[PDB]
Amino acid sequence: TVAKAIFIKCGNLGTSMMMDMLLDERADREDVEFRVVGTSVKMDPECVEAAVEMALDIAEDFEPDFIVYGGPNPAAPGPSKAREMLADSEYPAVIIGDAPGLKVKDEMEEQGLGYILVKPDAMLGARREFLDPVEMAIYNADLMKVLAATGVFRVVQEAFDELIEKAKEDEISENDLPKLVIDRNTLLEREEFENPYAMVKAMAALEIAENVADVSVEGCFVEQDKERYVPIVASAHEMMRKAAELADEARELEKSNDAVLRTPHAPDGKVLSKRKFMEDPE
Amino acid sequence: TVAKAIFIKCGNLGTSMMMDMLLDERADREDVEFRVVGTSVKMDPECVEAAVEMALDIAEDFEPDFIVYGGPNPAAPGPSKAREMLADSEYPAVIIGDAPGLKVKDEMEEQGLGYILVKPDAMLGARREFLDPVEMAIYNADLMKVLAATGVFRVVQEAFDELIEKAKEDEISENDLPKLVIDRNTLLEREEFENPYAMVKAMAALEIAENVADVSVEGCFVEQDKERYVPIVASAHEMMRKAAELADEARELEKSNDAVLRTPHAPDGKVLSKRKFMEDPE
Amino acid sequence: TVAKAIFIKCGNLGTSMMMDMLLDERADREDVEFRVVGTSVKMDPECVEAAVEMALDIAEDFEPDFIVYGGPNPAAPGPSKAREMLADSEYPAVIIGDAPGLKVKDEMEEQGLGYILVKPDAMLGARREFLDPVEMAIYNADLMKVLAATGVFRVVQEAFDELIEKAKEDEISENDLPKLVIDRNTLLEREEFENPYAMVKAMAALEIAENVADVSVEGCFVEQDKERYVPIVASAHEMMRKAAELADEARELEKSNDAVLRTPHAPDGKVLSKRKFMEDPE
Amino acid sequence: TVAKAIFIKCGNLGTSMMMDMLLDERADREDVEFRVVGTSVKMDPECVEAAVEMALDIAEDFEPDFIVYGGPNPAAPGPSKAREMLADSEYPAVIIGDAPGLKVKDEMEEQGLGYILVKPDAMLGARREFLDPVEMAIYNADLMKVLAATGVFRVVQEAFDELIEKAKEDEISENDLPKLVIDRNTLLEREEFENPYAMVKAMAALEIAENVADVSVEGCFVEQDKERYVPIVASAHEMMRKAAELADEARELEKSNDAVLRTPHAPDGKVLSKRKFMEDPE
Amino acid sequence: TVAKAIFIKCGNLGTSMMMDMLLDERADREDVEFRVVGTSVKMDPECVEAAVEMALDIAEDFEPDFIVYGGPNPAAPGPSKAREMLADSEYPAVIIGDAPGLKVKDEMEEQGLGYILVKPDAMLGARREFLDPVEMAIYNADLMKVLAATGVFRVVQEAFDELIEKAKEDEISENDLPKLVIDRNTLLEREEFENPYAMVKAMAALEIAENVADVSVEGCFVEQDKERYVPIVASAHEMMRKAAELADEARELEKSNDAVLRTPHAPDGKVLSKRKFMEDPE
Amino acid sequence: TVAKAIFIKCGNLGTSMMMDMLLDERADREDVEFRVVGTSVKMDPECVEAAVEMALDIAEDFEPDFIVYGGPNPAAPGPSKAREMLADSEYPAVIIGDAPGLKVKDEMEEQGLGYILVKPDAMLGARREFLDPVEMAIYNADLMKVLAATGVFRVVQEAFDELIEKAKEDEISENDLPKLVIDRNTLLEREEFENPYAMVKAMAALEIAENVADVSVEGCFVEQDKERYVPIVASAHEMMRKAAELADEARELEKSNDAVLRTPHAPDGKVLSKRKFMEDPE
Ligand SMILES: [Mg+2]
Ligand SMILES: [Mg+2]
Ligand SMILES: [Mg+2]
Ligand SMILES: [Mg+2]
Ligand SMILES: [Mg+2]
Ligand SMILES: [Mg+2]
Ligand SMILES: [Mg+2]
Ligand SMILES: [Mg+2]
């Protein structure tokens, strides 16, 4: 009873922003307790070491059943330092990352770490001439809408909820750690949408979101002429804004059919389900 | 000089989700270092105490210049416990909250605390029959878009950047702490928008967002018949979706005039500014 | 039996613009006859007195079963004069007004008057620097769309049609007069919408429309600096435009379900009903 | 000083709905005084005679400088009876009508009557299976938006305002009565729009609005198979809804250029003008 | 058995652009073979004679079962020459045209020619000051969306598929050739739309499209003052852009009901049919 | 002097549909004469050989200055046959294709052929269960809007207008033939858009359009389970519909600035230019 976990956040990913809250949406679950720590947007090896140190430090008394590290590119220097420290700890760990994480997928399975790699969680257009705090927040709002309305966050919610159950049985083995890669095609194996065109619009939203990453990468790391890289990173943000609109359109189709899936948590932690607006969740 | 701060997050508010990130959007500032801790969505007295303890314990070796506590309703039991603990501590502190915080504005002033109260940061429709994880993320995506595109996040960015400069004097007087209340009318004193209709559409979005809170409160704490409260809380979410569309319309108007204000940070922390897309921030 | 009524219009309210027309949409009812008089937009004591005099003078030979006075703020000087004059007359009467009318609800009950107070029928941003004839017509077009597509006009239609039936008994008791207050929550007791999301979008539109009044009041009667009040009244109009877009969205949802409620009058005054587009009203 | 007029309304036209209010938008003009009378939607010869009788009756003491009759089809039996009674009276008169009014244009000039015929003020789809009170109000909201945002109402405002000046000079001759026909091409002789695409979108809105009339006529009077006439009249309403959207798009273009023309009345009655949002009207 | 046909394209009409491709959408039909020839946008007598000569020269060895000539105005000099030449040949022929072709309907029947006249296939705003290559492509994109999404292209597909079945039996008589005039009302008897509001929106789109022709004709052939004709032809294109939006709205309504009609060809030529997205065409 | 060219169309690409018409948009150019021939959508070797044979047979008497072959995938068997045949002839030739043509760029240069490869001209979702004639036309409408409004068609127009000037002097060498590959980045150096956000939205549209091809290819050639490939190809079409919306948004931004570039042909062939709506092209 009452599973515990520590979430570590370094750098920012739409999924890492929301991961812990997706598990206790109304703060009324009594089978879980969480702690969240991090160094904000900084994700260099020095800053990531400090963050895992905090986590490992509080774990001593908190005693988490599992620890989660979430942020961009698990293949980078900083995140790699975190996988190192978590794999060689006494707590099972899961790494939440984006597409670049695929580079170290096998390496993570070798380290005995779990993972949830979200391909559509795309890097933003991080050039100083374009990305100020407001633009970053706008992009994150659009990405958050895409990940939520397409149902990607439900896949994540379900992974952590199943792990939370395995954890209560005090039996968390490596074979229990999730090993997920989420993308457009993930929706084909789900029953998220009652309307077929809502699922197809959600798929198109996820494909565009995944494609945003290549554009941001080109503008931030490849293109060196500012007359070209500023328009390039901005075009990636215009793409995400349309992906958010497709996701919104999909959700509205479910509303027209009074079939919006909702899977809220009960106080005991069980995931309920409902489709009709006035239907009690069971 | 490198300013340091600790952010504590209990419960969720749109402003508390982004507050730290607004200060180092591309993680390239070399004049700041942050630590972020919290108990996720739980904000009861027990959890908030644990949250502030973590922070104060870390504060020992971290030695921050100030501490920020962000979350809903500064007047509630948990947040009140945090105010007392921080007011008692040796660290200058700021409280980020929503409109219910106005109830203790005089009290926080006597406690020697600074505050940033964001009226449009409205409580969501937290009824189990309606609010599942996906719906909560969708609402927050709309609220984030409203607070970003209307310019509210820039007001918050500026307040903390002003405090960070003060901290570089290793002397933050109570007089230096912010005492801000942000709402629709805050825009009248800013020069956020070059186009006046973009300003008034942004004002309309903040008014609608502020008004969402009362609908949410009614459906969550007053109405007891589920046949009435489920529609009531869903109507609050439809309002926030349209507020986000208004904020988007305001920003597209600035785009049509090639007048989108951007204020990115330079590596040394200086806040630059630009309006024209192809112009460098200076 | 042919029921007869006189409508008096002083000042302008969305509900007073349409009230009489809602009762005989195609002018084919043979069970009613109306006379409409007023002083246009002027609603001062002098004009309203003249307005009611015209009505009472016509009433002599016309012999109406009831008289209706519609216009903003039943509590203002002019409207109060009309209430006294009608309360004193021999004709059963109903007062159509907006939210400020709540201030004299007990008084109208003591005056033996009926009333229909429409909270979403909000005062417009009447400042010379902003409100010209075209802007006033645009605002009223949006308000009309909101009151029509959310179902508020059907509530008004039904109240008067019920009174007209009573009048066909040449005996309208004070007990027969309507005593209605319409707002967002009125929809919860109706079966206007087959789709629940159309109902909640309509509720959100009525909430926004109701909230417009406070912004208008602030910009017209409280704020004295033109640099602040012109933006304030324009923001109220942007809010009403989005309320109209929400009401339009609700109706398109009913169209997607081929469930648009239509309740036309038959030649003898009977109110028919239909939902499916190709179905005859019965 | 202080001109007086009586407006008579029988049947409904978007222009007749708004005609008098366009002359005193904030009810603060002190150079005019108006009286409005009518028989609501009924426009048969019996009802129109009664309406003009009311007007002529109150004219005795009110002493209007001119009388206005507004409603659909001045060529119909009812409206023809009104032109008869007004032409043979001692008060100059103006007839406001729609396109069918062109049939009796010369006949009206022979009667010494003035006129303003608005081609885009189209008859609605008045079939019982489709048009209930709510649908009628929705259609009128869309038409009101078209007539207002395209600038048609300004043409009307200007005609009556010029007549109001001639009237104060106590010299209202037939050569002073307006003789206007308004349509899409009317916009080419105006300076309404600063942005050329706003004028072209407004022209397209007026062309569609004018074309709606032929569709309504076919569905109401020609087509007799209900499986065909119900879809036909509804298609006319869908056309008007898009005309309203084009008009809205035009106004938004003026907003993007901060060039929305506003011509408000001063208390003395002079028509002021302004373009920039923060510009005082002169 | 393989049906053979030659298509001749002179000038451009939306239906002539697509006519042949609507018959073998994936190029996998094993029962047809076509040749397409033309003189691009030129449609004067010299060019049309050259186009038809090319077709008849090819016909000697190709041995087509029928020949189709498509392009604007069958009554113009160029197209009239094609009609004479085709009428003089041994090959069954069909003329695809626009509304102006109605003028020569009797001539074509006497010439033994079939015809499909598409009234909504409206002439564009062909004035040099407005119509450049890009604008000509944007208009055609909107017109193509209208003709496709309203179902007009399905009527054309059906007519030719019927002729192809007869061609296979070498049994195409003059009485088998189509004599079709397509417009808004054609939609009333199609089984195209499951949702009635989709049909009604599609009808509104075709009505607006048909009306665009009169505007283009006024701006290209009647009005001679450029300050007037440039805005006029531009307004025609704004109308067509809104007609495409209506057609898009109709299709989205069918998607909401998972009822989008699809009628693909099987490899053997059979026209299959389906409505539900996941249902195989049969 | 009159330039002559033959266009061969096999299979369908958005650019091949429009290529010839972009050169004489109003059919009033006195300096060009074209012949167009093809086998409709069929592009297998047998059909392509027949199309090219038709062209070369016509060429003997027509004496074209250059020949253009346009259609999907220059590397496929059919198109490869056209390349061989055209490379073997005396007539300067240009191949218009899509991204798959990049594979044979070296072959074409060795063949002495020019080429214009349009990467955003994406293959559609050609599965029988989804693509019927109507869906194929809707997709092409969206693709045409993208290629036109983003300015891609202006690049094609310019390339051919340059070749036409050389054709007039009978001076078309192999080095004069284009070698162009068009994509999102092509827009960075065009002087197409006055507003920078219009350029950025246009770039986002071309990026999404280019990405549609990979989705269509996955659903048509890789995925073999219908429960998966039908949703996949449908998602490609939803992407293209949003790319057209972005292109539409870019054009509306240019309209807001009265800066829509237009480059019409004069009767003598000269390419004129204008930006302001009421400015004559020069
Ligand atoms: Mg024959
Ligand atoms: Mg034969
Ligand atoms: Mg014959
Ligand atoms: Mg036969
Ligand atoms: Mg050669
Ligand atoms: Mg040669
Ligand atoms: Mg060679
Ligand atoms: Mg040369």
Are C82 and C8 contacting, i.e. CB atoms less than 8 angstroms apart?
yes
Contact yes or no for A82/A51 (Cβ under 8 A): yes
User: CA F109 to CA F107: how far, in whole Å?
Assistant: 6
Tokens of D147: 């007539």
- The span from the CA of A114 to the CA of A101, in Å, is 12
Phi, psi angle pair for F58, to nearest 5°: -65, -40
What burial letters (b/e) apply to E134-165, b meaning 16+ CB within 10 Å?
bbbbbbbbbbbbbbbbbbbbbbbbbbbbebbb
Is the CB of residue B97 less than 8 Å from the CB of residue B13? Answer: yes
Chosen for mutation from C256, C274, C275, C276 (greatest number of chain E CBs closer than 10 Å) is C256
Which of the ligands is closest to the CA of residue E169?
Answer: 4
CA distance C200 to chain B (A): 5
Element (H, E) at B94: strand B93-97
The upper half-sphere exposure of residue E263, i.e. CA atoms within 13 Å in the direction of its Cβ, equals 17
> Using an 8 Å Cβ cutoff, are C173 and C66 in contact?
no
Measured distance CA(F161)–CA(F159) in Å, rounded: 6
**Residue C179 in tokens:** 């005593």
**Cβ-proximal residues to C46 (8 Å cutoff; 6+ apart), any chain:** none
Contacts of F61 (CB under 8 A, 6+ apart): none
Determine the Cα–Cα distance for residues F96 and E252; give it in Å rounded to an integer.
34
Cβ-nearest to D257 among F256, F260, F276:
F256
Chain F residues in contact with B260 (beta carbon < 8 A): 197
Question: Cβ contacts (< 8 Å) between A125 and chain F: which residues?
Answer: none
Helix (H/G/I), strand (E/B), else coil: F117: strand
Ligand 3: distance of its center to the CA of E110 in Å?
Answer: 6
CA dist list (Å): C11 to C14, C69, C73, C117, D264: 10, 11, 9, 15, 17
Closest among F118, F72, F76 to F210, alpha carbons compared:
F118
d(CA C128, CA D12) in angstroms, rounded, equals: 29
Q: How far apart are CA B261 and CA B255, in angstroms?
A: 10
CA–CA dist B119, B100 (Å, integer): 8
Backbone Cα Rg of chain F: 19
Q: Strands D32-38, C32-40: parallel, antiparallel or unpaired by DSSP?
A: antiparallel
Yes or no, beta carbons of C239 and B207 under 8 Å apart: yes
The pairing of beta strand B32-40 with beta strand A32-38: antiparallel
**CA D244 to chain CA centroid, nearest Å:** 16
Closest CA to A130 of B263, C259, D2: B263
Beta pairing partners, B36: A38, B7
Residue A261 is encoded by which pair of tokens? 């899936």
CB F263 within 8 A of CB F157: yes
3-state secondary structure of F127: coil
Q: What is the 3-state secondary structure (H, E, C) of E108-150?
A: HHHCCCEEEEECCCCCCCCCCCCCCHHHHHHHHHHHHHHHHHC
Largest CA distance in chain A: 58
Structure tokens at F243: 């790319």
Cβ-count burial of E188 within 10 angstroms (0-12 exposed, 13-18 middle, 19+ buried)?
middle
Of A241, A53, A251, nearest in space to A151 by CA:
A251
Instruction: Give E173: exposed, middle or buried? Use CB within 10 Å, 0-12, 13-18, 19+.
Output: exposed
Chain B residue closest in CA terms to D255: B197
H helical segments located in B218-276: 226-256
Angle at D60 between CA D57 and CA D63, to 5 degrees: 120
Nearest CA to E158 out of E97, E116, E100, E126 is that of: E116
Token pair, residue E118, equals 């598409």
Considering only the beta carbons, identify the residue of F255, F260, F276 that sits closest to D253. F255
Instruction: Give counts: helices (H), strands (E), chain B.
Output: 8, 6
Domain boundaries, chain A: 1-122+151-182, 124-150+183-258
- Cα-flanking dihedrals φ and ψ of residue D38, to 5°? 175, 180
**C257 residue type, one letter:** N
Which chains have 3+ CB pairs within 8 A of B? A, C, D, F
Region of E27 please: left (phi>0), alpha (psi -120 to 50) or beta. Answer: left
How much distance in Å is there from the Cα of E71 to the middle of ligand 3? 23
By C-alpha distance, the chain C residue nearest D54 is: C58
C33/D138 Cβ within 8 A: no
Considering only the C-alpha atoms of chain D, give the largest distance between any 2 of them, rounded to a whole number of Å. 58
Residue B32's beta-bridge partner residues?
Answer: B3
Contact C197 A278 (CB under 8 A): no
Backbone φ/ψ region at D151: left (φ over 0), alpha (ψ -120 to 50), beta: left
- For chain D, list the strands marked E by DSSP: 3-9, 32-38, 66-70, 93-98, 114-118, 179-182
Contacts of F87 (CB under 8 A, 6+ apart): F93, F111, F112, F113
Phi first, then psi, for residue F234 (nearest 5°) are: -70, -35
Q: What residue in A sits closest to F246 (Cα-Cα)?
A: A242
CA distance D239 to chain F (A): 21
- DSSP H stretches of helix in F125-195: 133-149, 152-168
First to last CA, chain C: 22
Tokens representing residue F192 in the block = 């197409």
Number of helices and strands in chain A (H, E): 8, 6
A253-262: burial string, b at 16+ Cβ within 10 Å, e else: bbbbbbebbb
Q: Would you give the DSSP letter of residue C176?
A: G
Chain A nearest-CA distance from B196, in A, is 19
CB atoms within 10 A of CB E48: 27
Nearest ligand, measured from the Cα of E162: 4
Method by which the model was determined: X-ray
CA angle E197, E201, E205 (to 5 degrees): 170
CB contact under 8 A, A277 and C253: no
Q: Give the separation between CA F100 and CA B237, rounded to whole angstroms.
A: 46
Listed residue (A249, A276, A252) closest to A262, CA to CA: A276
- Asked if C touches F (at least 3 Cβ pairs < 8 angstroms), the answer reads no
Whether D and A touch (3+ CB pairs < 8 Å), yes or no: no
Letter for the amino acid at F15?
Answer: T
Q: Are A199 and F231 in contact (CB under 8 A)?
A: yes
Of all residues in chain A, the one with the smallest CA distance to F215 is A207
CB nearest to A277's CB, from C196, C256, C257: C196
F16 → chain E, closest CA residue: E17
Residue E250, number of CB atoms within 10 A of its CB: 26
Q: How many CA atoms lie within 13 A of F9 on its CB side?
A: 26
Rg (CA), chain A: 19
| Residue C144: HSE in the Cβ half-sphere, 13 Å Cα cutoff | 29
Of A183, A210, A178, A187, whose CA–CA distance to A68 is shortest? A178
Amino acid at residue number D79: P
Residues of B in contact with F256 (CB under 8 A): 256
Answer whether CATH 3.40.50.170 is correct for domain B124-150+183-258. no
DSSP label at A11?
Answer: S
Determine how many CB atoms are found less than 10 A away from the CB of residue E57: 14
What would the two tokens of residue D173 be? 């001759």
- State the chains in contact with E (3 or more Cβ–Cβ pairs under 8 Å): A, C, D, F
Q: Taking the CA of residue C124 as centre, how many other CA atoms within 13 Å lie in the half-sphere pointing to its CB?
A: 27
The rounded distance, in Å, linking the Cα atoms of B63 and F33 is: 81
Cα radius of gyration (chain B): 19
Half-sphere exposure of C112 (CA within 13 A, CB side): 15
Contacts of D244 in chain E (CB under 8 A): none
> Which CATH entry fits the domain spanning F1-122+151-182: 3.20.20.10, 1.10.287.1120, 3.90.1140.10, 3.40.50.10830?
3.40.50.10830
Nearest Cβ partner for E281 among F128, F138, F262: F128
How far, in Å, CA of C254 to CA of C261, rounded?
8
Which candidate, F255, B251, E204, places its Cα nearest to that of A138? B251
Sign (positive/negative) of CA torsion E152, E156, E162, E164? negative
- E interface with D, Cβ–Cβ below 8 Å: 184-185, 188, 196-197, 199-201, 203-204, 207-208, 211, 215, 227-228, 231-232, 234-236, 238-239, 242, 245-246
Taking each helix axis as running N to C, give the angle between helix E226-256 and helix C226-256, from 0 to 180 degrees, rounded to the nearest 10: 50
Q: How far is E20 from A271, CA to CA, in rounded Å?
A: 55
Contact A247, A145 (CB under 8 A): yes
Instruction: Label residue E274 left, alpha or beta by phi (over 0 means left) and psi (-120 to 50 means alpha).
Output: beta
Say what angle helices E196-217 and E133-149 make with each other, to 10 degrees: 150
Strands B3-10 and A32-38: unpaired
Nearby residues of F282 by Cβ (< 8 Å), 6 or more positions away: F272, F273, F274
- What CA–CA distances, in Å, run from A251 to A19, A207, B230, E197? 21, 17, 18, 21
Which structure tokens are listed for F203?
């770039």
H-type alpha helices, chain F: 14-18, 45-62, 77-87, 105-110, 133-149, 152-168, 196-217, 226-256
C-beta of residue D47 within 8 angstroms of C-beta of residue D81: no
Of C201, C227, C228, the CB nearest to B238: C201
Distances (CA, A) of F129 to C3, C257, F126, F230: 61, 26, 9, 7
DSSP A208-239: HHHHHHHHHHIIIII---HHHHHHHHHHHHHH
Greatest CA separation for chain F: 59
Up-side HSE of residue E249: CA atoms within 13 Å toward CB? 25
**Token pair for residue F81?**
């046959």
Task: Tell me which residue in D255, D260, D276 faces B253 most closely, judged by beta carbons.
Answer: D255
Q: How far apart are the first and last CA of chain A?
A: 21
Name which of A6, A37, A41 to mutate to probe chain B: the one with the most chain B Cβ atoms within 10 A of its Cβ. A41
Specify the resolution in Å: 1.5
Dihedral over alpha carbons D263, D266, D269, D274 (to 10 degrees): -20
What residues in D contact C58, CB-CB < 8 Å? 54
Do D245 and E246 make contact, defined as CB atoms within 8 angstroms? no
CB-nearest partner of F24 from E23, E41, E263: E41
Q: Please, which residues have CB within 8 angstroms of residue D222's CB and are 6 or more apart in sequence? A: none
Q: How far is the CA of F175 from the centre of ligand 5 (A)?
A: 10
d(C-alpha B196, C-alpha D276), whole Å: 9
Neighbours of chain C (3+ CB pairs under 8 A): A, B, D, E
Chain C residues with CB under 8 Å of B227 CB are 188
The chain E residue lying nearest A256, using CA atoms, is E256
How would you label A178-189 residue by residue, b for 16+ Cβ within 10 Å and e otherwise? bbbebbbbbbbe
Please tell me the total number of residues recorded for chain E in this structure: 282
- Both tokens assigned to B65: 């210049």
**How many interchain CB pairs under 8 A, D with F?**
17
* B256, B260, B278 member nearest F257 (Cβ): B256
Contact C257 A256 (CB under 8 A): yes
What per-residue string of b and e applies to D44-66 under the rule 16 or more CB within 10 Å gives b? Answer: beebbbbbbebbbebbeebebbb
